[PDB]
RNA sequence: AGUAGUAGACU
């Protein structure tokens, strides 16, 4: 293992005095501070000046458009729908619709569908409402739930419905008339979802009786609650109809005693990409979600009025969004509840609480892109007007770069404008959705964060957001080429000098860097690295540059990689693992990272861009690169990671909130003392110490060639420079980058060149690829960039110390985002002796004391920003704030304090589950709620989320009396059923937060076993029989539910190899051939290829419609149902009769807040036992740090197992089973200010926080 | 007609 000798980077040993002289000249100049001061008049004026020049940008519209995705009403307290009530209500409703005289085509097709339903035969009405086992296809009813109407039986208007498959219009928001109208409409809706319709572990539950009273017992009565339970029914019917074989037919369902009818039209199925399900409703006008201007019509039928809504078309995303809408609104309102009680100190009153619930529900039902964009902008507008200086001018200017199509948008504009003006005018903090003033700032921003998270990800239009991601890369590449044809290639790759600045031919733009600044920044970082030479030499060795490639985890993953160039002109799209198996089938060795770089470097760095599907209003990047690109980036990030481990001010490679708040605490500690100065004559001038947080924010405009001169000048504590020159040669190869436009866009552009399309097509010069230079490629160089930023800030600190040595200032930072702290110095007294000192310095040559007389922190920021710009870093003038109190870093609101939003974690427990069974999804959903308990959510919220997500799962599978309700079959009570047999979850939060998830199963088994060992009773034998049936087919079994190189090894070969080499169940092979076999065994695993062939995560959650009755459980080599698995379970458990196998498996036994850590190699030891032949032992030795303490530590572990359990691993059956026990042995916890990192002081905090208003001692 | 958009789409 030798590194070849690459060419080093030429250097030019700079002088700090030259750049100090430049900075002195730069400070005696005219520089205006880029952030404006925040005044109420300036904010009102910005709203006026944007509002007046507004309507000339768009065309005025005549009516506000649609925003409700479904309309409906309720006669009273809703009762959910069974199959019998569906049939009777459908007959009632189609009798009522046949009395209509049709006019508008919706009425025509509703009358036709109802007529054909009332022609249905006596024996088809049976097969309409029939389970899909006894079902049998008849004349008009081919699927259960559908019928078959035909287009020869249709009124001429109905075929018009079937066949109906420059500036934008916008409501004038500058007009008080239209603002009053849209506000009146939305207040009518929101006022209508609040009417009191009327109602239809023991410690935690007694307190939860107090939360359930003050929350659920008030919100259980409202109209919004029952309408949410109704939308759930309508969406269950739509999801049923959206399958493949069903969607090609018609349907009619009815709800609420025949008060709401749902007509579903034939449509293309939702299993395929880009399809819709069209439908409409017919309903009695009354209490509901009604928007009367987007109803199709209203008729009068024997006195009562009926609303016919429009024909809606919905995608698969918004359908699941509306299916979970009740749960989302309820979870977000309970979140609001906790924040309010924490803030004010008691429970909210029922009037504001009901209005909050209704607002959340309306947002959950709209689900439009244009409202998501509004809340996206609002979370930036809120800190920009409560800060001292900020860029609110440009933010409010971007708030107006949209049309306001519907009426909910104009209503949102009004309430947002009022909130922003009232925030700038003024602690005191007005809420947005109620009439509540807050105390702390965190409550108000948390409210807007909660409203932003109610919107699903990916609401953007596909072919219009897929073109908007290529645009940024193309236009920054145009900028770079402009600079290259103006300055020449050498100044682009090498940088300018300070003499070029002051001659005046180069200016400090953004895609250009300074030679002196880069090298002197490296020199400051070097002065921090020269100290810890030992640890720095020992980190560069522990990255292992001679461990072979492909034998790391990351190089054999599931992450997507480009492949070889096709025929159409694009790249392939394989997976990391496929290209790992593809290289090894001609490599002939398993080479290491330097020898793969030496192997694959004549190829250029291809890349491709693929949407991240975020919720923010402009969707971002994510690149997919080839293998040679991934090699070079591996080399560079490994080097820079080893170096950046020992630098405290770099926060990428580095449990972030702990270190952040240590930095804040240090900085607040500096401003306790009081600096002062003695003058020439001996005047003693006293000063104060202030702080000024600059929450910075920002990167495609950034030359990647500054890193070469930064890398070559870094001290690393090595005996030579053969690795450094290889890192430089790797960086010299990521300069240029071929960029490929995706197939979707290339097709789309050909399905139609205006003006903005034609220049974009001229960039690619009539191909699919074009070269970019000096590109960052999203996060593929993050450790580099954050170390470079921290270096430049250190350079600034020393330069400020050497311009004003008299003044004992301060400085600190944090480069994830970024948070700079400036410890400036206030003259304290009112007397002019400070101004006289500034005079006495300003005549005596020191002209640069001109920028320090007044304000002064502005000059710290100006010089810091200029040095950062000389290193190509541009601080954003739009989303930066400046205030002497609050701060925001990497999505956490700091105030000195800490506050995580955590609502993302809850709203992810309802949406998106892995789809791997009942047990698997139950565990994932409950693990989300424990994780949200970690981050701020009090025991009762995580309890409510546990209850809700568990109920969602048991209804999504049917194990509740339903299709798979196991208590119909089994002789054990629901308490005693194991989990993976659809049993009761045995669910709590105060146990899952402390123990694990699979403890309760242990309990069930344990109970029977212990009862058995004392009584030999009968149902306990049955519990053991169920557990044995689980083990035949987690610390028990689980029921199983429902690619180029995928069979180079027949399955018997993989089984025989799995027996011959059972050490590899812990350890990745280092040789080639065991690796090729170990990797095909990783393919043929069908959990893995399940995770590859079902990549869009909506499809699997939606195919939980089919996965009910369908043959979806493995049993005896047969896909069967779920009911026959329970049949087989009861059979075996009543025919079972036996202990010590069971014994070896049972014998594993209001203040402000801060952030602590809760805590209750190894795999190489557990491999050392199964080490048998010489190759396997050499693999175990490579896999281990100190490879000769190993045979000691195993013995140390051995008796340790006998220490507290009572087992021997010198029996082979024991050690295969309790390997998870010894994997399992730091979840960060946002806990109050009087908590210590020991787990027994966090567990007391959780118990003390069971009551939100009353005190608890323990 | 719905989703979407100041980039021509889909049912």
Q: In terms of DSSP H, where are the helices of A969-1050? A: 999-1015, 1019-1032
Tell me how far the alpha carbon of residue A167 is from its chain's centroid.
34
3-state secondary structure of A596: helix
The answer to whether the beta carbon of residue A400 comes closer than 7 angstroms to any atom of strand B is no
3-state secondary structure of A983: coil
Distance CA A1123, CA A1129 (A): 10
Give the strand pairing for A59-60 and A169-170: parallel
Distance CA A79, CA A255 (A): 9
Residues A349/A434, Cβ–Cβ less than 8 Å: no
Distance CA A47, CA A420 (A): 10
Instruction: Kindly give the interhelix angle for A782-801 and A515-529, rounded to the nearest 10 degrees.
Output: 90
E strand or H helix that includes residue A826: strand A825-826
Residues A819/A696, Cβ–Cβ less than 8 Å: yes
- With CA of A275 and C1' of each nucleotide, the nearest comes out as B11
3-state secondary structure A1042-1098: CCCCCCCCCHHHHHHHHHHCHHHHCCCCCCHHHHHHHHHHHHHCHHHHHHHCCCCHH
Is the dihedral angle over the CA atoms A619, A872, A773, A724 positive or is it negative? negative
How long is the CA A168 to C1' B5 vector, in angstroms? 8
Distance CA A262, CA A237 (A): 9
Instruction: List the determination method.
Output: cryo-EM
Exposure class string for A898-933: b at 16+ Cβ within 10 A, else e: bbbbbbbbbbbbbbbbbbbbbbbbbbbbbebbbbbb
Q: For Cα atoms A317, A319, A324, give the angle at the middle one, nearest 5 degrees.
A: 100
Range A1217-1224 contact pairs with CB under 8 angstroms and sequence separation of 24 or more = A1217/A1035, A1217/A1144, A1217/A1145, A1218/A1148, A1219/A1066, A1219/A1166, A1220/A1035, A1221/A1148, A1222/A1162, A1222/A1166, A1222/A1197, A1223/A1162, A1223/A1163, A1224/A996
The answer to whether the beta carbon of residue A618 comes closer than 7 angstroms to any atom of strand B is no
How long is the CA A1082 to C1' B6 vector, in angstroms? 49
Torsion of CA A243, A249, A250, A251, to 10 degrees: -40
Distance CA A862, CA A864 (A): 5
Residue corresponding to tokens 């496929």 = A578
How long is the CA A755 to C1' B9 vector, in angstroms? 19
Tell me how far the alpha carbon of residue A572 is from its chain's centroid.
27
How long is the CA A917 to C1' B2 vector, in angstroms? 35
The answer to whether the beta carbon of residue A57 comes closer than 7 angstroms to any atom of strand B is yes
Nearest to A1064 by CA among A899, A1175, A1212, A949: A1175
Distance CA A1170, CA A1061 (A): 8
CA distances from A921 to A357, A654, A1006, A1147 (A): 28, 32, 24, 27
The answer to whether the beta carbon of residue A273 comes closer than 7 angstroms to any atom of strand B is no
How long is the CA A747 to C1' B8 vector, in angstroms? 13
Nearest to A514 by CA among A873, A34, A33, A21: A873
DSSP 8-state assignment for residue A832: T
How long is the CA A622 to C1' B8 vector, in angstroms? 27
Distance CA A757, CA A1052 (A): 56
CA distances from A423 to A35, A39, A428, A696, A1140 (A): 18, 10, 9, 22, 69
HSE, CB side, 13 Å, CA atoms: give it for residue A1070. 15
Which 362-391 residues of chain A approach strand B with CB closer than 7 Å? 368-370
3-state secondary structure of A252: strand
Distance CA A17, CA A19 (A): 5
How long is the CA A1170 to C1' B3 vector, in angstroms? 59
The answer to whether the beta carbon of residue A284 comes closer than 7 angstroms to any atom of strand B is no
How long is the CA A244 to C1' B4 vector, in angstroms? 25
* Bridge partners of residue A818, in order along the sequence: A696
DSSP 8-state assignment for residue A851: G
Cα radius of gyration (chain A): 34
Closest amino acid to nucleotide B7 (CA–C1'): A464
- With CA of A315 and C1' of each nucleotide, the nearest comes out as B3
Residues A824/A809, Cβ–Cβ less than 8 Å: yes
Distance CA A231, CA A220 (A): 16
Nearest to A357 by CA among A193, A217, A233: A193
Tell me how far the alpha carbon of residue A113 is from its chain's centroid.
44
Phi–psi pair at A834, nearest 5 degrees: -70, -45
The pair of structure tokens assigned to A25 is 């000249």
Phi–psi pair at A931, nearest 5 degrees: -65, -35
Torsion of CA A520, A524, A525, A529, to 10 degrees: 130
The answer to whether the beta carbon of residue A61 comes closer than 7 angstroms to any atom of strand B is no
E strand or H helix that includes residue A796: helix A782-801
Residues A230/A74, Cβ–Cβ less than 8 Å: yes
DSSP labels for A263-295? EE-----TTSTT--EEEEEEEESSEEE--TTSE
Q: For Cα atoms A1107, A1110, A1113, give the angle at the middle one, nearest 5 degrees.
A: 80
How long is the CA A95 to C1' B2 vector, in angstroms? 28
Q: Identify each DSSP E strand in A171-329 by its residue range.
A: 251-255, 260-264, 277-284, 287-289, 295-301, 304-309, 312-314
- With CA of A161 and C1' of each nucleotide, the nearest comes out as B1
E strand or H helix that includes residue A715: none
Which 401-440 residues of chain A approach strand B with CB closer than 7 Å? 402, 405
- With CA of A274 and C1' of each nucleotide, the nearest comes out as B10
CB atoms within 10 A of CB A1027: 22
Burial class (CB in 10 A: 0-12, 13-18, 19+), A562: buried
Give A720's contacts (C-beta < 8 A, 6+ positions apart).
Answer: none
CA distances from A865 to A696, A796, A838 (A): 11, 9, 24
How long is the CA A1103 to C1' B5 vector, in angstroms? 31
E strand or H helix that includes residue A1156: strand A1153-1158
Instruction: Kindly give the interhelix angle for A1163-1170 and A1190-1204, rounded to the nearest 10 degrees.
Output: 100
How long is the CA A755 to C1' B8 vector, in angstroms? 12
Which 155-174 residues of chain A approach strand B with CB closer than 7 Å? 164-169
Find the length of chain A.
Answer: 1258
CA distances from A575 to A175, A299, A565, A916, A1105 (A): 55, 58, 15, 22, 29
How long is the CA A229 to C1' B10 vector, in angstroms? 31
How long is the CA A246 to C1' B4 vector, in angstroms? 27
Distance CA A606, CA A845 (A): 56
The pair of structure tokens assigned to A916 is 């791997």
Which 85-114 residues of chain A approach strand B with CB closer than 7 Å? none
Helices H / strands E in chain A, number of each: 51, 32
Nearest to A235 by CA among A364, A128, A126, A117: A364
How long is the CA A276 to C1' B2 vector, in angstroms? 9
The answer to whether the beta carbon of residue A308 comes closer than 7 angstroms to any atom of strand B is no
DSSP labels for A395-419? HHHHHTSS---BHHHHHHHHHHHHH
Phi–psi pair at A331, nearest 5 degrees: -65, -40
Phi–psi pair at A574, nearest 5 degrees: -105, -155
Distance CA A68, CA A63 (A): 15
Query: Which positions of chain B lie under 7 Å from any protein Cβ?
Result: 1-11
Distance CA A272, CA A316 (A): 9
Q: In terms of DSSP H, where are the helices of A648-723? A: 657-670, 706-712
Residues A104/A308, Cβ–Cβ less than 8 Å: yes
Torsion of CA A843, A849, A855, A860, to 10 degrees: 180
Residues A1130/A971, Cβ–Cβ less than 8 Å: yes
Distance CA A886, CA A386 (A): 9
DSSP labels for A876-904? -SSS-EEESS-EEETTEEE--------HH
Which 463-502 residues of chain A approach strand B with CB closer than 7 Å? 463-465, 467, 471
- With CA of A56 and C1' of each nucleotide, the nearest comes out as B6
CA distances from A87 to A94, A123, A261, A288, A846 (A): 11, 14, 12, 23, 92
- With CA of A57 and C1' of each nucleotide, the nearest comes out as B6
- With CA of A401 and C1' of each nucleotide, the nearest comes out as B6
Q: For Cα atoms A951, A954, A955, give the angle at the middle one, nearest 5 degrees.
A: 85
Which 732-751 residues of chain A approach strand B with CB closer than 7 Å? 745, 748-749, 751
Closest amino acid to nucleotide B4 (CA–C1'): A461
φ/ψ region of A1166 (left if φ > 0, alpha if ψ in -120 to 50, else beta) reads alpha
Residue corresponding to tokens 């602590």 = A1156
- With CA of A371 and C1' of each nucleotide, the nearest comes out as B4
How long is the CA A863 to C1' B6 vector, in angstroms? 40
CA distances from A41 to A174, A386, A394, A427, A1040 (A): 18, 14, 16, 20, 66
- With CA of A277 and C1' of each nucleotide, the nearest comes out as B11
How long is the CA A267 to C1' B1 vector, in angstroms? 14
Q: Identify each DSSP E strand in A691-780 by its residue range.
A: 693-696, 736-740, 769-773
CA distances from A125 to A138, A149, A1109 (A): 10, 15, 21
Give the strand pairing for A736-740 and A606-609: parallel
Distance CA A313, CA A265 (A): 10
φ/ψ region of A1251 (left if φ > 0, alpha if ψ in -120 to 50, else beta) reads beta
How long is the CA A746 to C1' B8 vector, in angstroms? 14
How long is the CA A384 to C1' B5 vector, in angstroms? 29
Nearest to A318 by CA among A351, A276, A373, A285: A276
3-state secondary structure of A337: helix
Closest amino acid to nucleotide B8 (CA–C1'): A752
Distance CA A328, CA A322 (A): 9
């Amino acid at each position: 293992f030798n590194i070849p000798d690459y060419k080093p980077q030429s250097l030019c040993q700079p002088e700090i005095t030259n750049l100090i002289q430049y900075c002195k000249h730069w400070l005696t100049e005219d520089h205006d501070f880029v952030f404006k001061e925040v005044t109420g008049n300036n904010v009102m004026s910005s709203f006026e000046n944007n509002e007046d020049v507004y309507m000339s940008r768009y065309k005025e519209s005549r009516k506000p458009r649609n925003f409700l995705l479904i309309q409906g009403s309720i006669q009273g307290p809703y009762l959910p729908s069974t199959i019998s009530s569906d049939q009777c209500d459908t007959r009632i409703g189609c009798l009522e619709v046949l009395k209509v005289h049709p006019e508008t085509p919706v009425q025509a097709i509703a009358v036709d569908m109802a007529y054909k339903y009332m022609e249905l035969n006596r024996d088809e009405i049976i097969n309409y409402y029939n389970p899909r086992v006894h079902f049998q296809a008849t004349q008009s009813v081919k699927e259960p739930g559908t019928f078959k109407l035909g287009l020869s039986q249709l009124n001429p208007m109905s075929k018009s419905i079937l066949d109906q498959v420059e500036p934008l219009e916008s409501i004038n928001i500058s007009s008080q008339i239209q603002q009053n109208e849209c506000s009146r409409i939305i207040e009518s809706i929101l006022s209508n979802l609040e009417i009191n319709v009327g109602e239809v572990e023991l410690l935690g539950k007694f307190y939860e009786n107090e939360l359930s009273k003050y929350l659920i017992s008030i919100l259980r009565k409202t109209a919004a609650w029952h309408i949410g339970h109704l939308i759930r029914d309508i969406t269950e019917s739509l999801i049923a109809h959206a399958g493949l074989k069903r969607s090609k037919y018609w349907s009619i369902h009815a709800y609420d005693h025949g008060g709401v009818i749902l007509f579903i039209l034939p449509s293309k199925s939702l299993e395929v990409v880009g399809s819709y399900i069209r439908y409409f409703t017919v309903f009695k006008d009354g209490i509901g979600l009604i928007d009367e201007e987007n109803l199709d019509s209203k008729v009068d039928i024997d006195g009562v009025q009926w609303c016919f809504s429009k024909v809606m078309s919905i995608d698969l995303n918004r359908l699941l969004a509306l299916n979970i809408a009740f749960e989302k609104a309820l979870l977000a309102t309970a979140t609001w509840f906790q924040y309010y009680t924490e803030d004010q100190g008691h429970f909210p009153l029922q009037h504001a609480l009901r209005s909050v619930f209704s607002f959340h529900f309306l947002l959950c039902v709209s689900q439009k892109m244009k409202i998501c964009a509004i809340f996206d902008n609002l979370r930036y507008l809120i800190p920009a007007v409560t800060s001292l200086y900020s860029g609110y001018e440009l933010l409010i200017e971007k708030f107006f770069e949209r049309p306001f199509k519907s009426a909910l948008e104009v209503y949102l504009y009004n309430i947002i404008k009022a909130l922003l003006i009232s925030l700038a005018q003024n602690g005191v903090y007005p809420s947005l959705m109620s009439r509540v003033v807050y105390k702390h700032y965190r409550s108000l921003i948390s409210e807007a964060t909660t409203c932003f998270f109610l919107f699903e990800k990916g609401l953007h239009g596909n072919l219009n957001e897929e073109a908007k991601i290529h645009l940024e890369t193309v236009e920054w590449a145009r900028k770079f080429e402009a600079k290259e044809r103006k300055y020449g290639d050498i100044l682009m790759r090498e940088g300018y000098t300070i003499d070029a600045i002051r001659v005046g031919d180069v200016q400090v733009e953004q895609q250009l860097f300074c030679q002196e600044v880069v090298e002197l920044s490296a020199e400051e970082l070097n002065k921090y690295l020269q100290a810890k030479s030992q640890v720095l030499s020992s980190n560069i060795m522990n990255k292992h540059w001679d461990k072979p490639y492909f034998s790391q985890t990351r190089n054999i993953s599931l992450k997507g990689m480009s492949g070889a160039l096709q025929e159409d002109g694009h790249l392939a799209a394989s997976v990391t693992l496929i290209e790992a198996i593809r290289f090894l089938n001609r490599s002939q060795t398993n080479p290491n990272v330097i020898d793969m770089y030496e192997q694959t470097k004549q190829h250029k760095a291809q890349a491709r861009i693929v949407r991240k599907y975020q919720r923010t209003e402009a969707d971002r990047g994510f690149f997919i690169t080839t293998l040679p690109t991934r090699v070079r980036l591996e080399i560079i990030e490994d080097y820079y990671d080893a170096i950046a481990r020992v630098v405290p001010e770099e926060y990428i490679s580095y449990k972030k909130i702990l270190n952040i708040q240590t930095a804040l605490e240090k900085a607040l500690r500096w401003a306790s003392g009081s600096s002062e100065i003695t003058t020439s004559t001996g005047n003693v001038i006293k000063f104060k110490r202030r702080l000024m947080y600059v929450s910075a924010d920002a990167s495609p405009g950034d030359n990647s060639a500054k890193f070469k001169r930064f890398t070559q000048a870094l001290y690393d504590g090595l005996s030579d420079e053969k690795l450094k020159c290889c890192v430089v040669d790797a960086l010299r190869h990521v300069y240029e980058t071929e960029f490929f436009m995706s197939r979707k866009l290339h097709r789309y552009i050909d399905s139609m060149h205006s003006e903005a399309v034609q220049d974009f097509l001229d960039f690619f010069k009539g191909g699919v690829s074009a070269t970019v230079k000096g590109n960052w490629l999203q996060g593929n160089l993050n450790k580099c960039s954050s170390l470079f930023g921290a270096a430049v800030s250190l350079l600034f600190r020393r330069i400020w110390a050497e311009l004003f040595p008299e003044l004992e200032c301060f400085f600190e930072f944090a480069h994830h985002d970024a948070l700079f702290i400036y410890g400036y110095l206030e003259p304290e007294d009112d007397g002019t002796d400070w101004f006289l000192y500034v005079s006495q310095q300003i005549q005596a040559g020191n002209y640069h004391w001109h920028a320090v007389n007044q304000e002064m922190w502005k000059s710290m920021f100006n010089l810091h920003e200029h040095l950062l710009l000389m290193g190509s870093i541009k601080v954003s003038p739009k989303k930066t704030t400046v205030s002497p109190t609050n701060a925001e870093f990497l999505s956490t609101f700091f105030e000195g304090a800490v506050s995580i939003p955590f609502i993302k974690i809850l709203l992810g427990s309802l949406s998106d589950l892995p789809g791997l069974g009942f047990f698997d999804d139950l565990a994932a959903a409950q693990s989300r709620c424990v994780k949200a308990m970690d981050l701020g959510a009090s025991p009762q919220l995580a309890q409510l989320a546990v209850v809700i997500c568990t109920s969602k799962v048991e209804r999504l599978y049917g194990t509740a009396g339903m299709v798979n309700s196991p208590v119909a079959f089994l002789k054990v009570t629901k308490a005693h059923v194991p989990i993976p047999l659809g049993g009761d979850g045995s669910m709590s939060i105060m146990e899952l937060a402390t123990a694990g998830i699979g403890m309760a199963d242990k309990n069930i088994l344990k109970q029977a076993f212990y009862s058995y060992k004392h009584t030999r009773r009968d149902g306990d034998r049955y519990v053991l029989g169920l557990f044995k049936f689980l083990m035949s087919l987690s610390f028990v079994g689980k029921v199983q539910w429902k690619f180029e190189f995928y069979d180079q090894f027949s399955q018997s070969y993989l089984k025989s190899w799995t027996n011959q080499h059972p050490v590899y169940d812990y350890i990745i092979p280092r040789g080639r051939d065991n690796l090729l076999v170990y990797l095909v065994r990783k393919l043929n695993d069908p959990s893995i290829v399940t995770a590859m062939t079902m990549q869009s995560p909506l499809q699997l959650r939606f195919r939980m419609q089919a996965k009910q009755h369908m043959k979806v459980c493995k049993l005896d080599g047969e896909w069967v149902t779920f009911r026959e698995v329970l049949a087989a379970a009861d059979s075996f458990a009543t025919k079972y009769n036996p202990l010590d196998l069971f014994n070896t498996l049972v014998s594993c036994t209001h203040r402000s807040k801060i952030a602590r850590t809760f805590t209750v190699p190894i795999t190489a030891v557990i491999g050392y036992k199964y080490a048998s032949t010489v190759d396997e032992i050499s693999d175990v030795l490579d896999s281990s740090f100190f490879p000769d303490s190993l045979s000691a530590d195993l013995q140390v572990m051995k008796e340790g197992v006998y220490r507290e359990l009572g087992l021997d691993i010198g029996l082979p059956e024991v050690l295969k089973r309790i390997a998870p026990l010894l994997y399992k042995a730091s979840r960060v916890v946002i806990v109050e200010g009087n908590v210590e990192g020991t787990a027994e002081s966090i567990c007391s905090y959780w118990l003390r926080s069971m009551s939100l208003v009353k005190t608890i001692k323990v």
